[PDB]
Design an enzyme around this catalytic site. Structure first.
Site: not given
Ligand code: GTP
Ligand code: MG
Ligand code: GTP
Ligand code: GDP
Ligand code: MG
Lengths: 38, 343, 55, 430, 442, 442
Positions: F10, F70, F143-144, F178, F205, F227, F253
């Site tokens: 995500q 997802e 997780g993913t 989170t 973050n 982002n 390098e």
């Molecule tokens: N900077 C930033 N952090 C993010 C963003 N989206 C999620 N996070 C952070 O990343 C962590 C969550 O990881 P996710 O990316 O939601 O996990 P995932 O890859 O979706 O894994 P699954 O839940 O199993 O699908 C938390 O600490 C969130 O605050 C984003 O768009 N930008």
């Molecule tokens: Mg997810």
């Protein structure tokens, strides 16, 4: 069954020592030297 | 800065290769905010000249149908490459054509002065044409100007047609195109004259004078021409050509070992120049002596001190830039005329 | 090589199974091998190469 | 060099309608028959498939035969149906009943003479006749029985020409009829003796082409018949347009068939790609070559990776370099050398034609002679032996008049064809 | 004076198109057979006559026949741009091809067409006063080129006798290939060609592709490039008949100088200033540089490496601005080199020719314009390697009778395979025996 | 020349949207994939090639895959504004999420999807001629991202071998959090990232929130701001490949200059002129001020204090109007400072790069327009403090097996926890040992 990458799709250079269809020729020459001596 | 999204002007260009005898087409880009130029090949999308700074270029120089000097070579701008340069470079590039008649050659200098430095027309095409009656009728010259030499000028300025009509009204004798087809036919006339010009050849009593580009940038060409005519000379021949470094070397080879600033003098002849040929109707007038007396000493400071009324004392800035180059011997007339007018 | 074996009740618009392909297919229409139309056929190699040479 | 086409039965008439639509489109012939094309290259070979009727018109050299007129009324009602010559439609008064023996012996011998008169009338009008082309299914009734009857008669009357067939054969999974093994076995027995070249197509492969490659949501038989008409019209392209390296059906046979029984071929056509994806990938010789050998684009259920190529042929259409073709065919032969029969020094023939099919910059059609075709015949023979041991439906055929010895002969001949392919698969230099 | 060109099948007609394009542009004949009104004045000249004849109204027509069994290529020439140049009788076409079968061309189909060809050649030979040979262009890989070329050369050899026949022949490339049955057709062609040709020049498309990749900058070449290169070679060899020079070379001198024994008549060919227009102005191109160029195998138009054999004779043709002293200095430098070896029975290895006419530039062409060029044809034992791979491929295929039923059905005895294979075995042994050192006899 | 982008989960896909928005706007590619109609002049320049390929009709398409388990985020990309930019095959989506279980992603669900992804990456790598590394974006807290990122990096590392792999990684913040199970996923992820990555960039973050509150004037920031900052950093690092400059820096390098020992590859990142338009007109922005800024702890995008450690190497990228003499004067001033310390075995602590392209301004963006910017990536022992705090939270939870039954049920041995915790302990000890002076060790 793979065609391979694009950069390796070109013409291989010809090397008659490693041509599989000319091995009897080289064997014939190697025999011919001793045949000439005898 | 050196950003990639900075504003620019784009053109298609041509340049003749004297080594391979082949014509090459490029794409030229000019970033006017900082005076840098880049050139790319049309045929195979190859880089030709990396983005480099040139301090002698300006925004007013880049016009369609014009010519520039770049590293000693001449490059011709005949295109628009995108819509942005059509919007920016338009409204200041309308083309009009002006013709002059026989009775007004003795005042041609003031004609060019009023054409350039007061009516605002900047122009690079100027030739003298003599046509037979049938061809003149076909091309569409005015009937009253037939049987005589005519000077055609291809001008460029904002609102070219209306300003040309105003120029017609302001000074009598001249004629100007009233429609686009008239402009096209007169452009054909000037090109055909360029294919074979008119001048007197093989006359020992003749003189050729060249006007330097820096004199033209100060809008002083007409005054120079008028001053030359006033001294007792009759104009016979006019041209506007761009000469390369090889042509300048071939024209100036005998001077190798006389002038103390030879490479700088060679550079001063690059760009748009006017060519003048003068003859006299009286056998008692030597054209070279009077031409050199009017032109003055080739050193501008000496000219200013001793001959304050001379051309070089009037328009020179240094030894390399003395605003005129003129013949200095009694045999160079035919050679210069043959160089500058024989097809 | 297997065949699809799923029954799709919903229409394109609901994000299940083949919505993207369904949207594209309903956008364009019938199926043809040709991609572009109203383009002239190119000439042969002999006609294109061996033309009248410049004098 | 003129071809005569024969379309028999429902499948044949349906495929034929799309084929003659495609051919009329490439040469710019209106469904009224008027030429409306825009280059002389179209006119200079129109004779190959069309005869010229008076004041403009062109007529297509095809014979339509069927036992019930339902299909013929459907083709006559179609958008291009008017082009066909009325005298060329031959039909009976009762159906084949999905039975080979009826189609071959009872209504076959009754109609066949009028078909031979029409075929002779069409053949003798050509200034020089090239081979015949026949489309039919092997699983049907009138297609198999009357098609093979007519094929045998034409081979008696014209033994020096070429005989070419396009044939639809039953899927192992998607059967449409219970008695398919008998009709298929008897037809393959007839074909292996009579035919010069036979192409085989599985409907399952066309469905997999549509779903996986074209991602069509709701395909119809019109799409399958368009794919078939495209490949059918491609093989003849070098006959009827200029090119850098011309080719011909007889030259294809000479390069493809090592031994006279080994004349069963696989088919493919390369530039297949979905309307969404087409904006993302330009045509080039490597892309076509990569798709051409991908088994996804090959039109039978047997897969090449389980066999070996004896020979193959590729016909290229478009303005393209010969160097890229030669080096691609060398590269594919060198990297996959285990899948090519080693006692032939070069297995691929290439050919190049200047004029591509309309709306494509370039195209290739692929013909392959591969030993994996033995798997289809083995499946048909197993299902036949299961049915035959119990006389499962045999009384229909015996009541028409067949002797049981024909079934044992046809089974033995198919088993020997499978054995001969299997022997060449496992051959070695020693 | 005169020479007659015979073009057979697809390769021979397509190479003919490039050749006649070049000969027209070099002499100045327009595609309609005339000349411009201002080209008639000057000194009274005839050099075109070797290739063209005039009717008297001033049209030119060429001393050539085009032979094919399929119509398409000849119909393309008939409908092209040069329609008015050729006499319609000159363009001969059959109904259907020989389908890559030598037997179909030789026995079944060529026997009907051959008498028309002989009648046309007779009609040409009656309109000559100094015929000095036949030039033949064909490919040995296809059916009609092999079968009808052999049959026609046999008939010509009986009717005209001693007159010379020089062949330009496209042989199957050593790993690029176009058809399966190439070994059978090339072996069976070569059996007939052995008896009935005086010199045979061998070409391979793989070499011209390599040359066009390395020297020119062309990524995607096609047959028109190769055919234009071949046309340049033919123009270089025939220039010695047509223009002034210091050391002329008549067509009989090639045969006299290059062939030591009557079977040993297969020669290698190469061409020097293959160069692009952009590269040509940064470098001088002196005599010694192009002379050094002609001996690297990267310059050759046949895929063989001469370092694995010994040269027996070389013929070097120079055209353009060359002076004899530079040719002598170059040849002496070549002779000094250690990677160039001559058989010890040929001490005086070289023939030279020098012609003043520089090579012509073709409007669509890819070669630069250059003041001088050299072209070489040479006889070398390395050529034995070319036959051995074809013979091995024949043995591989013939061990299982892979395709023989086509040949036997179309009219040929099975015995003919064994005869041809035994003759090629004897030719291999001839090249083995000739290459044996005469030294150490005691 | 070329680089391939892999976006996982995500955070990685959402950061990818900002990255590709920026790269489009910098080159001038429109969202449909074509150059503007009033800007197509006929010829253009290769700088896009690092990130885009052309088909031939002039559409641009990007060298990226988007990977998720997802559908929702990828379906947002499919239905969003950039629908036409991406090739539809590149957008890969599974059926159901990895439910914050590393074990579920790695063992149960990712094993089905991974081979399609590898086939897509292979199809990309075949259409390249100078691929010089992989860029990977993922978060280790979920997780993913952890499980599939590890599995995919393992497979890539076996298949491609020596090719470089550069990771941008979002680690769990020290008090913003989170999800409950974040420590477990981050420890087990970090175990895989240690073996199979060449440089790893650390993000928190909480630092980007602090930076956007303090420097920018934003009271209520959201993920789109973060982002866009990440996209600016990636554009700064990849600018050395894409535009003309005085001192270029190739991706190979970075690894040679930044990594002293093969395990010591985790780097800190910072960016200097993050400033609003209202502050920007009150202040000049010379080279020395922004160089002093990047070393202040207020500039970093990771929550660590470098005053608790020693620097080993710094790589400083300047883009815009900068002159090398000013870079040298700035770096010479930094070395004098007493609160900046380098390990005594690294005397030449700095690498410089200078590129002419100034940073791009995004239409909805919050950064000001500025003539110059600098971006720093640096290797420092202070990072050991970041691992120790995650390990402490792991130790607290693991003492009671707080959630372990989920992981064991989805297929994992309990032993894997202890192995990973011992590997992170050894990494902490490596950072303790490397920082010990030689003068005390003699
Ligand atoms: N900077 C930033 N952090 C993010 C963003 N989206 C999620 N996070 C952070 O990343 C962590 C969550 O990881 P996710 O990316 O939601 O996990 P995932 O890859 O979706 O894994 P699954 O839940 O199993 O699908 C938390 O600490 C969130 O605050 C984003 O768009 N930008
Ligand atoms: Mg997810
Ligand atoms: N260099 C060159 N090779 C050619 C050309 N045309 C065909 N070839 C080659 O010659 C061989 C094919 O011989 P063809 O001339 O087509 O055979 P054919 O004479 O037509 O014999 P049939 O097919 O029976 O009619 C292949 O190796 C081709 O690559 C050409 O124009 N130039
Ligand atoms: N591909 C294709 N198959 C068809 C078509 N029409 C019928 N078939 C198949 O052919 C078989 C039926 O044979 P049919 O033509 O009715 O035999 P006939 O009664 O002897 O004419 C079945 O397998 C059908 O699925 C068609 O238009 N296209
Ligand atoms: Mg042929």
């Amino acid at each position: 069954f793979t065609l391979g990458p694009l950069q390796d799709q070109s013409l291989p250079p010809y090397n008659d020592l490693e041509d599989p269809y000319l091995a009897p020729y080289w064997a014939r020459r190697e025999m011919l030297i001793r045949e000439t001596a005898e | 800065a050196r950003s990639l999204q900075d504003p620019r002007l784009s053109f298609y260009c041509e340049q003749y290769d004297h080594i391979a005898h082949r014509m090459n087409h490029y794409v030229l880009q000019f970033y006017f905010e900082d005076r840098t130029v880049e050139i790319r090949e049309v045929t195979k999308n190859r880089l030709h000249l990396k983005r480099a700074h040139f301090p002698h270029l300006n925004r007013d120089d880049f016009k369609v149908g014009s010519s520039l000097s770049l590293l000693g070579g001449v490059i011709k701008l005949t295109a628009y490459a995108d819509e942005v340069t059509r919007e920016l470079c338009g409204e200041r590039g309308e083309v009009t054509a002006v013709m002059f008649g026989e009775q007004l050659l003795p005042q041609l200098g003031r004609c060019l002065a009023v054409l350039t430095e007061e009516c605002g027309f900047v122009a690079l095409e100027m030739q003298m044409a003599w046509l037979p009656v049938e061809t003149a009728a076909a091309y569409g010259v005015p009937p009253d100007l037939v049987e005589g030499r005519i000077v055609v000028v291809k001008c460029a300025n904002t609102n070219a047609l209306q300003r040309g009509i105003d120029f017609m009204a302001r000074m009598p004798g001249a004629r100007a195109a009233e429609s686009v087809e008239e402009v096209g036919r007169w452009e054909q006339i000037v090109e055909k004259a360029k294919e074979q010009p008119v001048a007197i050849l093989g006359d020992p009593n003749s003189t050729v004078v060249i006007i330097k580009p820096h004199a033209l940038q100060k809008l002083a060409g007409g005054v120079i021409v008028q001053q030359l005519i006033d001294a007792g000379l009759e104009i016979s021949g006019i041209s506007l050509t761009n000469m390369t470094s090889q042509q300048a070397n071939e024209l100036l080879k005998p001077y190798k070992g006389v002038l103390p600033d030879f490479p700088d003098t060679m550079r001063s002849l690059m760009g748009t120049v006017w060519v003048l040929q003068f003859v006299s109707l009286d056998e008692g007038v030597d054209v070279v002596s009077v031409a050199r007396e009017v032109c003055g000493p080739f050193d501008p400071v000496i000219a200013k001190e001793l001959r304050p009324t001379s051309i070089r004392a009037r328009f020179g800035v240094d030894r390399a830039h003395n605003a005129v180059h003129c013949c200095d011997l009694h045999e160079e007339g035919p050679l210069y005329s043959n160089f500058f007018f024989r097809p | 090589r297997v065949l699809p074996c799923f029954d799709n009740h919903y229409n394109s618009g609901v994000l299940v199974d083949n919505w993207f392909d369904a949207r594209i297919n309903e956008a364009h229409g019938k199926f043809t091998i040709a991609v572009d139309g109203q383009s002239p056929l190119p000439s042969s190699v002999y006609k294109a190469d061996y033309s009248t040479p410049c004098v | 060099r003129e071809i005569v086409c024969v379309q028999a039965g429902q499948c044949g008439n349906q495929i034929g309608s799309k084929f003659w639509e495609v051919i009329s489109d490439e040469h710019g012939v209106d469904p009224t028959g008027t030429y409306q094309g825009d280059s002389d290259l179209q006119l200079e070979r129109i004779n190959v498939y069309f005869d010229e009727a008076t004041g403009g018109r062109y007529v297509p050299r095809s014979v339509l035969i069927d036992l019930e007129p339902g299909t013929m009324d459907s083709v006559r009602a179609g958008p291009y149906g008017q082009i066909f010559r009325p005298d060329n439609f031959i039909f009976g008064q009762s159906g084949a009943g999905n039975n080979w023996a009826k189609g071959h012996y009872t209504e076959g011998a009754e109609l066949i003479d009028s078909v031979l008169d029409v075929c002779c009338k069409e053949a003798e009008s050509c200034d020089c006749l090239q081979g015949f082309q026949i489309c039919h299914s092997l699983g049907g009734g009138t297609g198999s029985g009357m098609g093979t009857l007519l094929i045998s008669k034409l081979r008696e009357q014209y033994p020096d020409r070429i005989m070419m067939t396009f044939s639809i054969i039953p899927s192992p999974k998607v059967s449409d009829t219970v008695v398919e093994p008998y009709n298929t076995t008897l037809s393959v027995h007839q074909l292996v003796e009579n035919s010069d070249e036979s192409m085989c197509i599985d409907n399952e492969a066309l469905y997999d082409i549509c779903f996986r490659t074209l991602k069509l949501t709701t395909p119809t038989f019109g799409d399958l018949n368009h794919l078939v008409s495209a490949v059918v019209s491609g093989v003849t392209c070098c006959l009827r347009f200029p090119g850098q390296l011309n080719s011909d059906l007889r030259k294809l046979a000479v390069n493809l068939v090592p031994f006279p029984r080994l004349h069963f071929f696989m088919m493919g056509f390369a530039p297949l790609t979905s309307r969404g994806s087409q904006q993302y990938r330009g045509l080039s010789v490597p892309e076509l070559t990569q798709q051409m050998f991908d088994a996804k684009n090959m039109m039978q259920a047997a897969d090449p990776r389980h066999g070996r190529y004896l020979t193959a042929s590729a016909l290229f259409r478009g303005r393209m370099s010969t160097k890229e073709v030669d080096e691609q065919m060398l590269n594919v032969q060198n990297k996959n050398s285990s899948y090519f029969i080693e006692w032939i020094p070069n297995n691929i023939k290439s050919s190049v034609c200047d004029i591509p099919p309309k709306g494509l910059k370039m195209a290739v059609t692929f013909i392959g002679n591969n030993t994996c075709i033995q798997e289809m015949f083995r499946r048909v023979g197993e299902q036949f032996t299961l049915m035959f041991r119990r006389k499962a439906f045999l009384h229909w055929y015996t009541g028409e008049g067949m002797d049981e010895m024909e079934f044992t002969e046809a089974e033995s001949n198919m088993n020997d064809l499978v054995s001969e392919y299997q022997q060449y698969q496992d051959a070695t230099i020693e | 004076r005169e020479a007659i060109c015979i073009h057979i099948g697809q390769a021979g007609c397509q190479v003919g198109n490039a050749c006649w394009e070049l000969f027209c542009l070099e002499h100045g004949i327009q595609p309609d057979g005339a000349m411009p009104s201002d080209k008639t004045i000057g000194v009274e000249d005839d050099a075109f006559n070797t290739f063209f004849s005039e009717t008297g109204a001033g049209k030119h027509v060429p001393r050539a026949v085009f032979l094919d069994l399929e119509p398409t290529v000849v119909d393309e020439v008939r409908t092209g741009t040069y329609r008015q140049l050729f006499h319609p009788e000159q363009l001969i076409s059959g109904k259907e091809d020989a389908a890559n079968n030598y037997a179909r061309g030789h026995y079944t189909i060529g026997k009907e067409i051959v008498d028309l060809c002989l009648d046309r050649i007779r009609k040409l030979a009656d309109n000559c006063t100094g015929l000095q040979g036949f030039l033949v262009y064909h490919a040995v890989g296809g059916g009609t080129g092999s079968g009808l070329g052999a049959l026609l050369l046999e008939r010509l050899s009986v009717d005209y006798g001693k007159k010379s026949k020089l062949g330009y022949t496209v042989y199957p490339s050593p790993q690029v290939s176009t058809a399966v049955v190439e070994p059978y057709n090339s072996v069976l062609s070569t059996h007939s060609l052995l008896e009935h040709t005086d010199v045979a020049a061998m070409l391979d498309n793989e070499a011209i592709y390599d040359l066009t990749r390395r020297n020119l900058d062309i990524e995607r070449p096609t047959y028109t490039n190769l055919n234009r290169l071949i046309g340049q070679v033919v123009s270089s060899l025939t220039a010695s008949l047509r223009f002034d020079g210091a050391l002329n070379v008549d067509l009989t001198e090639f045969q006299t100088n290059l062939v030591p024994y009557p079977r040993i008549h297969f020669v290698l060919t190469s061409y020097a200033p293959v160069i692009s227009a952009e590269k040509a102005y940064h470098e001088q191109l002196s005599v010694s540089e192009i002379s050094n160029a002609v001996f690297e195998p990267a310059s050759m138009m046949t895929k063989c490496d001469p370092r694995h054999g010994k040269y027996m004779a070389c013929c070097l043709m120079y055209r353009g601005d060359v002076v004899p002293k530079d040719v002598n200095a170059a040849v002496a430098t070549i002779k000094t080199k250690r990677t160039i070896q001559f058989v010890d029975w040929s001490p005086t290895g070289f023939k030279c020719g020098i012609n003043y006419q520089p090579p012509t530039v073709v409007p669509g062409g890819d070669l630069a314009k250059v003041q001088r060029a050299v072209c070489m044809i040479a006889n070398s034992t390395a050529i034995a390697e070319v036959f051995a791979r074809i013979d091995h491929k024949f043995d591989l295929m013939y061990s299982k009778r892979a395709f023989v039923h086509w040949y036997v059905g179309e009219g040929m005895e099975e015995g003919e395979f064994s005869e041809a294979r035994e003759d090629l075995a004897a030719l291999e042994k001839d090249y083995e025996e000739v290459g044996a050192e005469s030294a150490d006899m005691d």
